[PDB]
Design a protein around this ligand. Sequence first.
Ligand code: ADP
Ligand code: MG
Lengths: 63, 57, 375
Amino acid sequence: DIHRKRMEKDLNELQALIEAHFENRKKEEEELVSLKDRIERRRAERAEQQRIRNEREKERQNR
Amino acid sequence: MDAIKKKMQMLKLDKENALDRAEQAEADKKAAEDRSKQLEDELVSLQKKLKGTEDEL
Amino acid sequence: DEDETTALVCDNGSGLVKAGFAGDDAPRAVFPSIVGRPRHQGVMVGMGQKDSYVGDEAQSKRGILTLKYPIEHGIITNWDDMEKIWHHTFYNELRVAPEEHPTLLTEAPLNPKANREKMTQIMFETFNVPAMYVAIQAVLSLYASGRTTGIVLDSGDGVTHNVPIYEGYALPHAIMRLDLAGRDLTDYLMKILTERGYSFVTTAEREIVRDIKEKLCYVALDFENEMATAASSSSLEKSYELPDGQVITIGNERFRCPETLFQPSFIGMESAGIHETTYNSIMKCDIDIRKDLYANNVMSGGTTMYPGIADRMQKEITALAPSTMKIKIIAPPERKYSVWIGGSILASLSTFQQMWITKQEYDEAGPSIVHRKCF
Ligand SMILES: Nc1ncnc2c1ncn2[C@@H]1O[C@H](COP(=O)(O)OP(=O)(O)O)[C@@H](O)[C@H]1O
Ligand SMILES: [Mg+2]
């Protein structure tokens, strides 16, 4: 009688398998969107630092 | 992945389970040919007895 | 804590402690049985300066602590260590008070009766558990399998036990304990790695090499032929990335380490391999049911996560025993929790509270009452 109860709980865990998948998939999508916005963040940061280094150079010859 | 581990486990184990039910059935089949063998032996011995019966008669 | 007064289920397995609530599917607080103590004395201030370190805290603080085992092969060193680790488990890890929940515990097979009497007495005096029950892990693994017939191979970290049980009946006359376990495995691997050029003594490397055993180790199908082909074996040779970053390569050792349990003559045991111990165990009992024992063997323990035990098991038993009936092993995934699951199973049914070991029975007959209350 106890054994059928185990057969059932494993079955519960079995379907739970997909439920374990869901949190991993949301975390994957969060990493997705963070990297995608990091793309343009990196590009804009590169442009900003190029401008900053330009100001550095002009102040360099100005002294 | 751990999910992959479990997947292969349930699939392979059910495979072995099905094969094993196949061979337990095959064991019952063997005991069935056994029963048939004893029944045919008894039938042949009974036929011999009947022919001897008619000869004695 | 649940609103209901459900019981505590705690498996103090020889190597791992797994504790939780009754009615749960898996234990909540699971930790190895290592205990760390400050390697030096106190002069600093502002943080730390705590004696006992248990659980993941000690795992993180392995390097600074002398790592000691409060239990080894069942033998008990210091009850204070169990007192502290149970305090930690109940309050810091389970967040539960034992006052309102009876405890179901599992003990290593054939544990000392004096050990049971002392541990129960210190428990009852120190703690305020309402009721008690302790059972052998063999029947717990049986319950996890849910089949009353079979021989249980319990491979803990201190002892390996072979116990036959037919139709839910213990057979102590055919039960044996073998002193080969994880400790031996680590030792043997330590000496082989010493012969490979890497010689360590401390426990951190012990855990590293048991992790290596968890990951890479083989169980050789044929032993000397596999070292013969493992002479070069560029593909068969396997490597590991140690946390410091060095790449450590091991070849035949992967399947030469677990082999020692099968071949004890490597480091000098009179007893033969554990398959011989299951074989003798089987024949000690009446002939007829032996076939069922062959077909219903179960294996349990954390070690069972390794590959190769099943194929080796069946092949050698078929070599020893006649090959008419088919021998097949059963082993559910993640069976090291299975004992604890069986504990929950014990609390599932409503007859279990008929034989709770209450406080007043112990107060009347002392510890001696357990001699009549469990068995
Ligand atoms: N995930 C795992 N994979 C492989 N081996 C493991 C794993 N977890 C634990 N072990 C091994 O199991 C041993 C502990 O055995 P344990 O399960 O405590 O025995 P028992 O069943 O008697 O409690 C440890 O020495 C460790 O090497
Ligand atoms: Mg075990």
